[PDB]
Amino acid sequence: ERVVYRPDINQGNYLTANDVSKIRVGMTQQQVAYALGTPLMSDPFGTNTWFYVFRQQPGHEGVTQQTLTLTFNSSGVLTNIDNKPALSG
Amino acid sequence: AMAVASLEFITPTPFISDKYANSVRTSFFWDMGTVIRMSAGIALQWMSPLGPLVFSYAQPFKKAEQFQFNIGKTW
Amino acid sequence: FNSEEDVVKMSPLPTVENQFTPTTAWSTSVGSGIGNFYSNLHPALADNVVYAADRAGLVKALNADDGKEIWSVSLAEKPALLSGGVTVSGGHVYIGSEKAQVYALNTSDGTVAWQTKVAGEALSRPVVSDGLVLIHTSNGQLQALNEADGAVKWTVNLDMPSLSLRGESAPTTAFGAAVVGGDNGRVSAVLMEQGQMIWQQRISQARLSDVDTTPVVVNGVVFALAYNGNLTALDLRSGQIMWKRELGSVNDFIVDGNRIYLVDQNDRVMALTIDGGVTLWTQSDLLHRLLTSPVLYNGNLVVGDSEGYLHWINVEDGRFVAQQKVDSSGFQTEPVAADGKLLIQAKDGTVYSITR
Amino acid sequence: VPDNPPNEIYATAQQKLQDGNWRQAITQLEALDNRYPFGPYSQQVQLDLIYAYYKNADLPLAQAAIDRFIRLNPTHPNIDYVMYMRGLTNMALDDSALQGFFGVDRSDRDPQHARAAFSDFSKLVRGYPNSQYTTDATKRLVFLKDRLAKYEYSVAEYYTERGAWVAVVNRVEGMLRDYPDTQATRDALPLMENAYRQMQMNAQAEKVAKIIAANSS
Amino acid sequence: SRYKRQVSGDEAYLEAAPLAELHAPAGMILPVTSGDYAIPVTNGSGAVGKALDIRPPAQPL
Amino acid sequence: FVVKDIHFEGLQRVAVGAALLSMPVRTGDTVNDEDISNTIRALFATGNFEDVRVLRDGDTLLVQVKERPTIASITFSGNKSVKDDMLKQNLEASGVRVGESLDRTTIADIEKGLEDFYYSVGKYSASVKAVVTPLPRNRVDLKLVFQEGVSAEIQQINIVGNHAFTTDELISHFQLRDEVPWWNVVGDRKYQKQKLAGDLETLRSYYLDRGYARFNIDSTQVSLTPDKKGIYVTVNITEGDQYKLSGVEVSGNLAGHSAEIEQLTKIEPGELYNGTKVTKMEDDIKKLLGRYGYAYPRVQSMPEINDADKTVKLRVNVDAGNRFYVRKIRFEGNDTSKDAVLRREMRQMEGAWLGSDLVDQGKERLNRLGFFETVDTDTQRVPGSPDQVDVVYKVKERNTGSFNFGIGYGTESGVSFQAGVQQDNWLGTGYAVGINGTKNDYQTYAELSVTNPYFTVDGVSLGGRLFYNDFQYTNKSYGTCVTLGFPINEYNSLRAGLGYVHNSLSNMQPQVAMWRYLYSMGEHPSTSDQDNSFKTDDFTFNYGWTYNKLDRGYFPTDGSRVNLTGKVTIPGSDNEYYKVTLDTATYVPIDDDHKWVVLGRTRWGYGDGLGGKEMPFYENFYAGGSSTVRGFQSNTIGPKAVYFPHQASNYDPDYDYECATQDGAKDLCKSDDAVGGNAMAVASLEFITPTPFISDKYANSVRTSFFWDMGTVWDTNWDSSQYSGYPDYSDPSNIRMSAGIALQWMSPLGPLVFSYAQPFKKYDGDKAEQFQFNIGK
């Protein structure tokens, strides 16, 4: 058992169904940042991919996470989407 | 619980040169406390690199804490 | 748990033999008085009846020979802060208040004639001219009222400092035109029938320098003065500065025998010559002891102390001459220059009639 | 502090300074500065006064005196010495209090005095690379960058325990771009790998794994 | 004063670990450097540690 | 004419070259006396000295300046009504830079400047005099000295044009005062300009809160009496009319939540207008947007006041804006403290959406450390990003530790020695260490304690304590405990721990309530003489629980509190017993506004032996005195001892006469001295009602109540049958009650408690103490 009162862990970008349906193939990179807000995570190792992660651990022991990975070609145009709506654990 | 309330009037001792007597005080005080009792007291104070130092002589009218030496510093 | 401090160290009561034996002929208590509240509540006279009031609101009319009252009315709800000089003319007594009321009373029986709101507290005494009552309020507004109704005929607005001495500056009239003081050092004048503006003049640099004091006008010369300001003389027709003195003033002044009699901010008394700021004499004695308005009575200038005494000064000589009884809790408002008579009201509500 | 009819206050005060009687030095230098503010004993005096404040550990006053000097004479021919003392005064504020006596590695305490110090020494050696001080200043800079990186790791360590996995990755990435070559960055790469793994971001986890596995000794 | 251990001059800032830049594996690059940058090597004859005379210059004016 | 050279001598403040470059015409220029005079004007513009002589007698000009003492030291003759640092900083801001320049004109200026300052604070009577003396090397020393009266008393504050409310009710809410009564004489007539303005805002808000939406403070003025020692304040009101509020319409770019925004803005159409209602309603809107992460919303409320009827409709316009993310948290000034020691206790999460309430909840929790004098805060947007914020907390390290030592004396008391050292935030680790130690002629005490409030990152505190406590009945005791305390909810703390304690009782007086225990422990001491000892080792499991949702914290109005603690020994102890405590306080309001309240407090205790042993008498419960039931001497409510006769007693018969002194009693002495019971049941019901003398400036701070108390303590296994002659302590029905008044007062010298209580129901030996005093209950 563990019962100690943790505050709600929350991390990353906020996600909602009406915000993710904005993204579609071929948008320019500034349009994505305008629709969803700025990416709080990106690949620093020299490939232009943004990791919109939405994560919460509400209350006692519940856990939830959505991940939305966006891949851009050079000059900042979106090529592919990888949306996982729930933690694949 | 312990409770103490005290009031005091100052009349410094010039035993030492004014220069060193600037860092010195002498005071006369009355207090009431429940532990109910009332008391009157004489106090000498000095300051040093060790912190502040007090020597005090007192009489509780309910008669004892009649003679005290005290030091108290924050770090 | 307490402490106190002082600066001015007022004069140690200079004193002299009471040569002319001036003393109370009669005295009456109307009630409470102004007490500590500086406010120009003072008694007045008409047709051998003297009228007086208590700042709580209660007002009385007294016979000047013996001091027995004939009235009592409350002017109040079931205090009024009745405040400002009592003024009397013919059928009516007029009184101001610190509660924006002006009251009119019937001189025949003391019944309340009419009551009308004015724009703010009426610290000025009312003044009656040309069939109108003029009142100057603390909001810097002259208001002219119909004497049978108090209905406003016209109103005029003056500039208000962010900090002032009390704005009494009661108006005066000549040739059918009014002249008035005001805060921020302004003298001004207006046409009595309609409130049209006439010339205005800035008494001094301004830091307080309110012209809080009623400007007397004689032969067409207006005299005006201010706190840390300058005494000035003014052409009623143009407001040209005839002359000035760096002597300031604090409460009141009088012209009689075309000679000027003053009280300085330092509670010293002096007489100035017909024109130009030069003193015949100065009585530097009473320094920093609040002096009432000086009244010329039967050839002697009488001034009341903050405490109980009345000091008697010669009309033209530089002599301090007599010192009457220590009257109850002293004075804080101007005696009345009654013809052949004296009446003064002490702080506590005791009124005194004085003879020699 | 004393009456000084003669400028001799500067010679005997130098002797007190050579003796390390810092008390005497600052008080006589302050007296000389106040009494002779515009003579030759002014620039000649401000430097010794700065040095005495530093050795007296009177660092807030040392900051003010150094700041005054650079403002009043930005081109003095030994201004590089004043920059070196700027960095050393700021670096002396970092090692505050009784820590180290108990062995407390205080490298987690507020780094701003360290980060300032790094700016000062780097400004020096970029400006005056021929100066004698550049060897020490570069030794001071390598320690100051490692001390900053240990701070950043310390926060990455805390958020690893709190499980704020975005707060981990976003800071250890910050170390890789601001502090790449320090040992503390090499110690942080496991926390980045862990954080990506807990977030199911395995691709990034493998990438950081490839980095660390190539760079481990 | 609390800094008395520090202004008397510790040696302990020497023998701090030497810097060593990471080398990226094939198929990626490390992040581009963005601050607190690598200091120019500027090696020279200048003294170091307690050998450095911290006092003001050989003539003070 | 052309000048080939320029002569100067002196140059004490400024060199010739600096003058020549400052001068408009220079060596080699065509010049004439007008140009030379312009150079003298340039000398005056740089401002050396006004006295100069100039001569032309050739191709060179001679000029000399009459240098005169100017380089000023400043001193003031003390200051009875302003602080030394404020005085000197006002002087320096006014312009007298020490050692720059000083002149007789500047002396006049600074005099008037300090005068005007003194008048600005309000001691309008004050006078300032400044004097200088000259010193070699162009130096002067400047002394200034002050005279003042008492700062002026405000006379009658008066409001005019008001009709909805009486003047005395309006000015009573001011912080300026017309009158200070015969009581609460701590008030004062000190005028303050900034507080007068605040008092106008209070007058405006009061009328808006009463619903006069058309209200306007059209004008105000302040006046000073001729003797410059008394002030008048007068305020003009245009009241307009009382207004009724129409339903709120909300519009603009609400980023969802509109159904909740609606619910938050629903108001019945019968209510009056109310200023604080709209501002409180507007504040909830922006805080509600903040909670969802719209940290910088834009909101405006516009009243559509009607004139044809007394109705007003609020229009509220909202847009949510961007959903800011906290990209960094920084702590600055965090010297001598581990950063984790702050981050662990600050609540907002880095790398997540900015809940501005969570940032402020952090600021609160950092203050609850007490480590910091102040916790300032800022949030700042990163340059070149529209969307991301750095949060920074700026702290001043409070000097958290304390160190103490002391000595005492007196022939009637003996030597006394005391010591102590405390440091919350030990080396910045956030551990709290604390050592204590005391000795007198007789008692010895020492304590060492450690708490680690974050043994687990979720805030599981772990504590550890050692004690030695040695007294002469004679008792040497020493022991240890270690505890875990971890919150299970916001309202609901829980804790657990293990302890060890050793006891070495000796020379205790023979008495039934104690001997019964010893016989139960399998010790058979003498009953006849005061020579005995009973060493034991004990091991315990300690637990407790604490529910606490009291609303107001200081003087709660509503909610409840329930503390529970208990002990069992664990097998291996010499003692085998358990005890339990329940300790509760419920508040319920009995008016809709929280003016009237009633309390019900209770305590229940219990303990017993296990396995045929018995609960040790030193753990027995006590009742009576301010904590429990009022009107009885503290702790004296329990069953009183009965001693066995033991005429071989303590040494001296000249002392206060014992039971069975050398010449004393021979039967069981029914004592007057109280002993606790193993059982306890206290209740009090307490009605809270405001005084006949309230005003809202202090009615929140003088909590007065009427109370009914009901206490008992009993000794559940006192075998009354065998002791026919002595009053039954096993009977729980000996309930003893009292009533009285209580007055809880928060005034600066402390949270005092006054009480008077009458014991309308008591038994023999209950020492009464009707009047009682306490602090901080």
Please tell me which chains touch E, using 3 or more CB pairs under 8 Å as the contact test: A, D
Residue F198 has which token pair?
Answer: 């605040």
Chain D residue with CA closest to A86: the answer is D200
Chain D residues with CB under 8 Å of F327 CB are: 170
Cβ atoms within 10 Å of C68's Cβ, excluding its own: 10
Q: Would you say B58 and B29 are in contact if contact means Cβ atoms under 8 Å apart?
A: no
Breaks in chain C, after residue numbers (C to N greater than 2.5 Å) = 78, 206
DSSP C258: T
Backbone angles phi, psi at C279, to 5 degrees: -90, 130
Residue F537 has which token pair?
Answer: 């080792």
Alpha-carbon gap: D141 to the closest alpha carbon of chain A (Å):
26
- Strand-pairing partners, residue C259, are C256
CB contact under 8 A, F400 and B70: no
Alpha-carbon gap: B65 to the closest alpha carbon of chain F (Å):
7
Q: What percentage of chain F's residues is helix, strand, coil (to nearest 5)?
A: 15, 40, 40
Alpha-carbon gap: F514 to the closest alpha carbon of chain C (Å):
55
The pairing of strands F139-147 and F71-76 is parallel
CB contact under 8 A, F337 and D99: no
CB burial readout E26-40, b (16+ within 10 A) else e:
eeeebbeeeebeebe
Chain F residue with CA closest to A7: the answer is F347
Residue D186 has which token pair?
Answer: 């090499």
Asked, for residue A65, whether it belongs to a domain, the answer is: yes
Q: What is the C-alpha end-to-end distance of chain C, expressed in Å?
A: 50
Residue C205 has which token pair?
Answer: 């640099």
Q: Would you say F142 and F178 are in contact if contact means Cβ atoms under 8 Å apart?
A: no
- Reading phi first (left if > 0) and then psi (alpha if -120 to 50, else beta), residue D209 is in alpha
Which residues lie closer than 8 Å to F655 by C-beta, 6 or more apart?
none
Q: Which residues of F touch B (CB under 8 A)?
A: 399-410, 412-413, 423, 749-750, 773-777
CB contact under 8 A, E18 and D142: yes
User: Is any Cβ of chain A less than 8 angstroms from the Cβ of F386?
Assistant: yes
User: In this complex, which of A44, A53, A55 lies closest to D176 when CB atoms are compared?
Assistant: A44
CA distance F631 to F551: 29
User: In this complex, which of F80, F224, F236 lies closest to C120 when CB atoms are compared?
Assistant: F236
In a 3-state reduction of DSSP, which class is residue F213?
Answer: coil
Cβ-in-10-Å burial (0-12, 13-18, 19+) of B31 comes to: middle
Which residues lie closer than 8 Å to D215 by C-beta, 6 or more apart?
D186, D189, E22, E23
CA nearest to C323, candidates C337, C342, C303, C346: C303
Q: Would you say F224 and F152 are in contact if contact means Cβ atoms under 8 Å apart?
A: yes
Alpha-carbon gap: D162 to the closest alpha carbon of chain E (Å):
26
Chain F residue with CA closest to B64: the answer is F413
Supply the range of the domain harboring residue C21.
4-356
Alpha-carbon gap: F203 to the closest alpha carbon of chain C (Å):
18
In a 3-state reduction of DSSP, which class is residue D106?
Answer: helix
Looking at residue F142, its amino acid is L
CA distance F176 to F156: 10
CB contact under 8 A, E39 and D148: no
CB contact under 8 A, A4 and F459: yes
CB contact under 8 A, F386 and A38: yes
The pairing of strands F60-65 and F5-7 is parallel
Alpha helices by DSSP H, A1-89:
17-20, 29-36
- Strand-pairing partners, residue F211, are none
CB contact under 8 A, E28 and A45: yes
A and F interact (at least 3 Cβ pairs within 8 A): yes
CB contact under 8 A, C139 and F221: yes
Q: Would you say F620 and F676 are in contact if contact means Cβ atoms under 8 Å apart?
A: yes
Chain F residues with CB under 8 Å of B45 CB are: none
Chain F residues with CB under 8 Å of B34 CB are: 773
List of domains in chain D: 1-217 (1.25.40.10)
Asked, for residue A40, whether it belongs to a domain, the answer is: yes
- Strand-pairing partners, residue F601, are F585, F684
Q: Would you say F339 and F365 are in contact if contact means Cβ atoms under 8 Å apart?
A: no
Q: Would you say D182 and D118 are in contact if contact means Cβ atoms under 8 Å apart?
A: no
The DSSP string of F362-405 is HHHHHHTT--EEEEEEEEEEPTT-SSEEEEEEEEEE----EEEE
- Structural domain count of chain B: 1
Asked, for residue A4, whether it belongs to a domain, the answer is: no
The DSSP string of B5-56 is EEEEEE----SS-HHHHTTEEEEEEEEEEE--EEEEEEEEEEEETTEEEEEE
Residue C179 has which token pair?
Answer: 């002249």
Q: How many residues does chain F have?
A: 777
- Structural domain count of chain A: 1
CA nearest to F328, candidates C205, D167, D186, C143: D167
Which helix (H) or strand (E) covers residue F327, if one does?
strand F325-332
CA distance C281 to C268: 11
Interface test with C, best of F120, F160, F180 (most C CBs within 10 A): F160
Alpha-carbon gap: F410 to the closest alpha carbon of chain B (Å):
6
Q: What is the largest CA-CA distance in chain A?
A: 52
Q: How many residues does chain D have?
A: 217
Q: Would you say C179 and C213 are in contact if contact means Cβ atoms under 8 Å apart?
A: no
The pairing of strands F597-609 and F679-688 is antiparallel
Alpha-carbon gap: F768 to the closest alpha carbon of chain B (Å):
15
Chain E residues with CB under 8 Å of A47 CB are: 28
Give the experimental resolution in Å. Answer: 3.6
Which residues lie closer than 8 Å to C40 by C-beta, 6 or more apart?
C83, C84, C85, C123, C124, C125, C166, C168, C333, C334
CA distances from F97 to D64, F72, F94, F146 (A): 17, 8, 9, 20
CA distance C174 to C181: 15
User: Is any Cβ of chain E less than 8 angstroms from the Cβ of D59?
Assistant: yes
Tell me which residue has tokens 């307690």: E50
Please tell me which chains touch B, using 3 or more CB pairs under 8 Å as the contact test: F
What is the distance of C-alpha F616 from the center of its chain? Answer: 41
E and B interact (at least 3 Cβ pairs within 8 A): no
User: In this complex, which of A41, A57, A88 lies closest to D166 when CB atoms are compared?
Assistant: A41
The pairing of strands F244-251 and F311-319 is parallel
- Strand-pairing partners, residue F404, are B72, F420
DSSP C77: -
Supply the range of the domain harboring residue B42.
3-71
Chain D residue with CA closest to E30: the answer is D176
CA nearest to F589, candidates F550, F627, F562, F624: F550
CA dihedral over F417, F422, F426, F431, signed as positive or negative: positive
CB contact under 8 A, A47 and E30: no
CA nearest to F704, candidates F749, F758, F740: F740
CA nearest to C270, candidates C303, C237, C310: C303
User: Is any Cβ of chain E less than 8 angstroms from the Cβ of A7?
Assistant: no
Residue C336 has which token pair?
Answer: 């009345």
Alpha-carbon gap: F397 to the closest alpha carbon of chain B (Å):
12
The DSSP string of E11-54 is STTTTPPPP----PPTT--PPPP-SSPPPP----S---GGGS--
Beta sheet of C132-136, edge-to-edge order: C127-129, C132-136, C141-146, C152-157
CA nearest to F215, candidates F255, F242, F176: F242
- Structural domain count of chain C: 1
A and B interact (at least 3 Cβ pairs within 8 A): no
In a 3-state reduction of DSSP, which class is residue F698?
Answer: coil
What is the distance of C-alpha F579 from the center of its chain? Answer: 36
CA distance D167 to D169: 6
Residue C174 has which token pair?
Answer: 């000549």
Which residues lie closer than 8 Å to F604 by C-beta, 6 or more apart?
F580, F581, F582, F583, F680, F681, F682
CA distance F189 to F230: 10
Q: Would you say F317 and F299 are in contact if contact means Cβ atoms under 8 Å apart?
A: yes
Chain E residues with CB under 8 Å of D188 CB are: none
- Reading phi first (left if > 0) and then psi (alpha if -120 to 50, else beta), residue F183 is in beta
Chain C residues with CB under 8 Å of F156 CB are: 37, 98
Q: Which CATH number is A27's domain given?
A: 3.30.1450.10
Q: What is the largest CA-CA distance in chain C?
A: 61
D and F interact (at least 3 Cβ pairs within 8 A): yes
Chain D residue with CA closest to F13: the answer is D38
Interface test with A, best of E29, E33, E34 (most A CBs within 10 A): E29
Method: cryo-EM
CA distances from D108 to B42, C249, D154, F697 (A): 49, 72, 6, 47
Chain F residue with CA closest to B73: the answer is F403
CA distance F151 to F122: 6
CB contact under 8 A, C36 and F80: no
CB contact under 8 A, E24 and D214: yes
CA distance C194 to F260: 62
- Reading phi first (left if > 0) and then psi (alpha if -120 to 50, else beta), residue E2 is in alpha
CA distances from D50 to C39, D89, D110, E50, F69 (A): 65, 10, 25, 19, 30
- Strand-pairing partners, residue F61, are F6, F56
CA dihedral over D180, D185, D186, D190, signed as positive or negative: negative
Which helix (H) or strand (E) covers residue F202, if one does?
helix F193-209
Chain F residues with CB under 8 Å of C139 CB are: 219, 221, 236
In a 3-state reduction of DSSP, which class is residue F35?
Answer: helix
Which residues lie closer than 8 Å to D92 by C-beta, 6 or more apart?
D54, D57, D59, E3, E6, E7
Q: Would you say C291 and C301 are in contact if contact means Cβ atoms under 8 Å apart?
A: no
Supply the range of the domain harboring residue A57.
9-84
Chain D residues with CB under 8 Å of F336 CB are: 96-97, 99, 109
Interface test with A, best of E22, E23, E28 (most A CBs within 10 A): E28
Chain B residues with CB under 8 Å of F400 CB are: 75
Residue C279 has which token pair?
Answer: 């003193």
Interface test with A, best of D159, D160, D165, D208 (most A CBs within 10 A): D165
- Reading phi first (left if > 0) and then psi (alpha if -120 to 50, else beta), residue C245 is in beta
Cβ atoms within 10 Å of F688's Cβ, excluding its own: 22
CA distance C173 to C218: 10
CA distance A53 to A48: 16
Alpha-carbon gap: E32 to the closest alpha carbon of chain A (Å):
8
CA distance F275 to F260: 22
- Strand-pairing partners, residue F300, are F317
Alpha-carbon gap: A66 to the closest alpha carbon of chain F (Å):
14
Residue D111 sits at the vertex; the CA angle it makes with D105 and D114, to the nearest 5 degrees, is: 95
User: Is any Cβ of chain F less than 8 angstroms from the Cβ of B48?
Assistant: no
- How many C-alpha atoms does C277 have within 13 Å on its Cβ side? 15
Cβ-in-10-Å burial (0-12, 13-18, 19+) of D146 comes to: buried
The pairing of strands F325-332 and F388-397 is parallel
CA distance F392 to F337: 16
Q: How many residues does chain E have?
A: 61
